[PDB]
Swiss-Prot record, chains A, D:
Source organism of the structure: Homo sapiens
Known outcome of mutating residue 61 to N: In AMYLD1; amyloid polyneuropathy
Effect of residue 38 to V: In AMYLD1; amyloid polyneuropathy with carpal tunnel syndrome
UniProt gene name: TTR
Function: Thyroid hormone-binding protein. Probably transports thyroxine from the bloodstream to the brain.
Outcome, altering residue 75 to N: In AMYLD1; vitrous amyloid
Effect the entry attributes to changing residue 38 to R: In AMYLD1; amyloid polyneuropathy
Positions bearing carbohydrate: 89
Protein name: Transthyretin
Outcome after substituting residue 45 to K: In AMYLD1; early-onset amyloid polyneuropathy
Stated consequence of mutating residue 1 to R: In AMYLD1; amyloid polyneuropathy
Whole sequence portion shown: 30 to 144 of 147
């Protein structure tokens, strides 16, 4: 599991469950090509987005549908979505946990890069 | 004026100075069209990006070039930038302060939205 | 002046208004002795807590009563307060902005430290 | 495991390893009585602080020795330590994950309260 997304809800103090997450890889013409997606689990986690072989070096965007999340909770969100854009190495894998802490008008994202 | 970007460096406890900030507005159309850009001042603030009249309803993207910031300080950061995307002025003109707090492997962004 | 506390509400995207803030300084002695206190204004800022001369070297504790803030908005928050503890003026007088960004189950605090 | 502490390093994008954490419970005379402590593991986590029976309702302080952490990494920290003070319920357990994201001049703490 080279890429994992964990999303937390700072309002409810809970995993952010059922948050849509899209992953894009930057194509040669600089467009975002869809790569992977899923919804965060009961634990606010999204595993199995990619595999080591598929998760090559490149620029990746993780788009977290924070707006729909806040919408479902009846809370006015500010952001359309939380985007995390990063280069996957050099030098090598490396597992990536993209942690997002969500509030209606604020989010943080943190990369926990291990091995 | 109606849009300000304030950037802090969570490593130094300082304004993040000379941080490039690009603002885009989503067109008809769905493409991001260049709206405004600037750099943060010595206070980490970027003022004067737009005017109440120019800053109409829309979906705006504020792209903060955090990577160049960190790289100019010798740090290979995780993120390419900090991008903040939001609908502005949906229920009337507001002032938006887009705050980013930067760490090499983390940023937060906070919107402070006021009336006018 | 040398110490300012700025509090934001990450749920509303607003200054956190009327937030009680208590500042303590560690005495000789190891006890926290009451240094200053105040409430945040409509800008979420608390100015005038101290003066350069009063704000000497020390370990300071800024206790932000986030609980009362959230509870006055109907929310049972997680934290009792946001407490920021730091050594001030170790290498000379500085200006300290203590920023807190509040969510019912999370806060961040950021120090912006400048010269003078 | 009713109380868990997870600490992340926003500078290195890594678990904050070997971070001293003290847990205090507020005594009747409002003093902080030491309750539990440990050091975050390789995964930036600290488990086994307490048990359901011992982790009664009360006001608890989790003190995270962020300063020594930054000291060991040769980075000037601002804070003496990250303190998290909270009431353990009502109404009941409930597992508490106290997540702290650390930077030299900023930290966030988030409570992930489940069940």
């Amino acid at each position: 599991c080279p890429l994992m997304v964990k999303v937390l809800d700072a309002v409810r103090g809970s995993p952010a469950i059922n948050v849509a997450v899209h992953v894009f890889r930057k194509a040669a013409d600089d467009t975002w090509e869809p790569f992977a997606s899923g919804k965060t689990s009961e634990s606010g986690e999204l595993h199995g987005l990619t595999t080591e072989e598929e998760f090559v070096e490149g620029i990746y965007k993780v788009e977290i549908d924070t707006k729909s999340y806040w919408k479902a909770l009846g809370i006015s969100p500010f952001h359309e979505h939380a985007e995390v854009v990063f280069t996957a190495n050099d030098s090598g894998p490396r597992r990536y946990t993209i942690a997002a802490l969500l509030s209606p008008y604020s989010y943080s994202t943190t990369a926990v890069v291990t091995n």
